[PDB]
Amino acid sequence: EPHRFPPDFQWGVATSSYQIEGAVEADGRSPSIWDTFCARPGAIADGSTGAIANDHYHRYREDIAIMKQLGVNAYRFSIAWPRILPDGRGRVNQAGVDFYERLVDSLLEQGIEPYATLYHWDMPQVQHDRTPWYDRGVVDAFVEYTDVITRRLSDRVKYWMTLNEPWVISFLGYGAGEHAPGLRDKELYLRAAHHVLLAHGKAMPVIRANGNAQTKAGIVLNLNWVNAASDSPEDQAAARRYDQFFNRWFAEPLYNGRYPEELLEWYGRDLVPVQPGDFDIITTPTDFLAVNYYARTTVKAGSTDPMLQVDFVRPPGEYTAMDWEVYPQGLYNILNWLHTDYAPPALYVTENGAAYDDQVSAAGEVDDPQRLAYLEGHFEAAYRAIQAGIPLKGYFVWSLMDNFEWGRGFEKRFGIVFVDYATQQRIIKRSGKWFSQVTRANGL
Numbered sequence: 001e002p003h004r005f006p007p008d009f010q011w012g013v014a015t016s017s018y019q020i021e022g023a024v025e026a027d028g029r030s031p032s033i034w035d036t037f038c039a040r041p042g043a044i045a046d047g048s049t050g051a052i053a054n055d056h057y058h059r060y061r062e063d064i065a066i067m068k069q070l071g072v073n074a075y076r077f078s079i080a081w082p083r084i085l086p087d088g089r090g091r092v093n094q095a096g097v098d099f100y101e102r103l104v105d106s107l108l109e110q111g112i113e114p115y116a117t118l119y120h121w122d123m124p125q126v127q128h129d130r131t132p133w134y135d136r137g138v139v140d141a142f143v144e145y146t147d148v149i150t151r152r153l154s155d156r157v158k159y160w161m162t163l164n165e166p167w168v169i170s171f172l173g174y175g176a177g178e179h180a181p182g183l184r185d186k187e188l189y190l191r192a193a194h195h196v197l198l199a200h201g202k203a204m205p206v207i208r209a210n211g212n213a214q215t216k217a218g219i220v221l222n223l224n225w226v227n228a229a230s231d232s233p234e235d236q237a238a239a240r241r242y243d244q245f246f247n248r249w250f251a252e253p254l255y256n257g258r259y260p261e262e263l264l265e266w267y268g269r270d271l272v273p274v275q276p277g278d279f280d281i282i283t284t285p286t287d288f289l290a291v292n293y294y295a296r297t298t299v300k301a302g303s304t305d306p307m308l309q310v311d312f313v314r315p316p317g318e319y320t321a322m323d324w325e326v327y328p329q330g331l332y333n334i335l336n337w338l339h340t341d342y343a344p345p346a347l348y349v350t351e352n353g354a355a356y357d358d359q360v361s362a363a364g365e366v367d368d369p370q371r372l373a374y375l376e377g378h379f380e381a382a383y384r385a386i387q388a389g390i391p392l393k394g395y396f397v398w399s400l401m402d403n404f405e406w407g408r409g410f411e412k413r414f415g416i417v418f419v420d421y422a423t424q425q426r427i428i429k430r431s432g433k434w435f436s437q438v439t440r441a442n443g444l
């Protein structure tokens with residue numbers, strides 16, 4: 001009664017360049033804003049950096065053979081700007097383009113469809129020094145990079161995502177100081193949020209011009225299910241503000257050419273650097289909307305976040321090692337909201353997964369029953385979305401393998417494949433062996 005996904009459903013895994021590649025000085029790559037941020041005392045919980053990570057730069061063929069064992073028909077990765085244009089603009093680093101050619105050819109040779117993210121947070125440092133996200137000149141810098149890389153690969157890459165999680169780039173990078181470049185200012189976050197949207201909309205016709213009739217592109221939004229802690233008017237309004245901040249701030253511009261008006265007023269409307277024609281650019285038609293979903297966030301009126309006047313509440317329930325509530329209904333809820341309000345022609349889940357404490361048994365196995373249960377419940381929510389008529393075309397598990405989890409460093413393991421950092425040994429987890437069966441059965 002709750003069995004099979006559509007016959008051409010895309011089952012994948014996802015990664016990003018800085019989280020897995022390592023070889024940070026190899027083959028002409030220049031430092032990213034993350035290579036510099038990892039130097040800051042207190043920025044990374046375990047004091048780690050992405051300098052080596054999974055060494056996927058060297059080990060990609062072995063990682064693609066693991067993908068074949070998992071039976072995925074798709075693979076979501078990001079392209080490092082610092083390998084392609086190490087001076088940020090101008091001179092193409094041929095050897096960096098060459099890595100992504102070898103990666104894309106190794107994937108298509110194994111029948112794995114490439115889903116390429118253009119921007120997953122690793123701007124070159126030298127380019128951030130000229131154009132941070134809050135400087136409108138960042139838009140043409142991103143379009144130039146997009147132009148260069150899409151010209152080289154669009155014969156072989158059909159699916160293109162512009163930027164990964166505008167909320168993270170803007171708010172964690174410039175509003176909360178938790179991600180590179182590590183600034184913390186309401187105005188800088190709002191400028192960066194606007195310029196991310198404009199870089200999305202200006203990139204879109206360049207991806208299309210450099211491609212063919214098969215080329216599909218879209219943006220990737222992180223979205224979480226937001227819940228008021230109670231029916232108190234103060235708590236309902238706290239939830240609505242947080243929802244406006246987290247979920248609607250990017251979606252409303254993308255589909256309706258407006259920011260959420262109540263939150264825009266709350267902030268100071270003049271702080272957002274909107275020019276005439278900007279919403280026409282931001283609303284440029286997309287082929288799909290990609291969604292990164294992890295959790296339910298429960299909000300009360302409070303002062304924890306002084307910017308939004310909210311506190312977070314943990315309902316009784318199940319939490320990952322990140323302290324993120326496990327709420328698979330939230331994924332159905334988000335997909336249904338997007339379907340009803342915006343009618344994207346296609347939806348992808350480009351990230352969903354969990355971090356739990358993992359150990360290699362005496363027998364060399366990784367028994368992760370809480371990660372397996374996490375995935376089973378979310379896959380079941382996706383199946384329900386499809387049965388309700390929501391045009392969900394694919395699902396990418398975060399992550400293929402344990403990697404550098406940004407401010408959490410390597411202590412949080414998201415992989416369905418375990419990495420022994422002492423040896424770079426990959427061990428497919430119990431959750432990975434289970435997924436190996438889901439992909440092959442195309443269902444649960």
Ligand SMILES: O[C@@H]1[C@@H](O)[C@H](O)OC[C@H]1O
Pocket residue numbers: 165168222294406
């Ligand atoms: O994507 C985001 C994560 O990387 C960070 O820890 O804070 C919020 C998340 O949704």
Ligand SMILES: O[C@@H]1[C@@H](O)[C@H](O)OC[C@H]1O
Pocket residue numbers: 016164165222292351398405414
């Ligand atoms: O890259 C990932 C990000 O997109 C998600 O929200 O945060 C977890 C990271 O693993």
